């Protein structure tokens, strides 16, 4: 839902209480904190971009 | 605009410094000479003819003494304090100082 000018933003609240609003996929993935070792490869993919 | 890394304060060496006062007039001599040292530093700055100082943050020694600040106020020199080691490259290119 975050592709194109008609997409929407996400809010993420971490375990400390730091709440952010962002659209950039790189800043979303860094905060999601995905655990599964296979899906975490998508976080490294976004780093290259 | 000038960028100073020299500490405008009392003299100090890398070695441990101790000054002994062993006489009546000697106590006055220590206070008087220190004031002269700091004033002499400000005189060098004014003779160059700067208007604004950028003072780099110091850890071991006071970057600017209270006496030096008073003297610089009398010289009408404006001082910006606490410039970080990470600011120097950007400031130098932007203003042109060294």
């Amino acid at each position: 839902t975050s592709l194109g000018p008609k997409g929407m933003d996400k809010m993420i609240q971490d375990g400390k209480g730091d709440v952010t609003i962002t659209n950039d996929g790189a800043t979303i993935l860094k905060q999601m904190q995905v655990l599964h070792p296979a899906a975490r490869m998508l976080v490294e993919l976004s780093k290259a971009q | 605009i000038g960028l100073i890394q020299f500490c405008l304060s009392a003299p100090k060496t890398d070695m441990d410094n101790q000054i002994v006062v062993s006489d009546y007039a000697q106590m006055d001599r220590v206070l008087r000479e220190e004031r002269a040292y700091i004033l002499n530093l400000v005189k060098q700055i004014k003779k160059t003819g700067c208007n604004v100082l950028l003072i780099q943050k110091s850890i071991l020694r006071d970057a600017l003494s209270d006496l030096a600040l008073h003297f610089l106020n009398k010289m009408k020199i404006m001082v910006i304090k606490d410039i970080e080691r990470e600011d120097i490259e950007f400031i130098c290119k932007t203003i042109g100082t060294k």
Partner: protein, 49 residues
């Protein structure tokens, strides 16, 4: 007006600065709006045939 907006503005500026960087590195552009995705889907199908 708000810390959440200012932080997002910082990221938005960064992206726009990088877009120009991309044009400096590789002085060529394409149409957006899905153009390369539709063109790839059609021509790659013909390749596979």
């Amino acid at each position: 007006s708000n810390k959440l907006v200012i932080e997002e503005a910082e990221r938005s500026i960064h992206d726009a600065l990088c877009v120009i960087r991309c044009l400096v590195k590789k002085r060529a552009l394409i149409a957006g709006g899905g153009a390369p995705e539709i063109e790839l889907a059609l021509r790659l199908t013909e390749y596979s045939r």
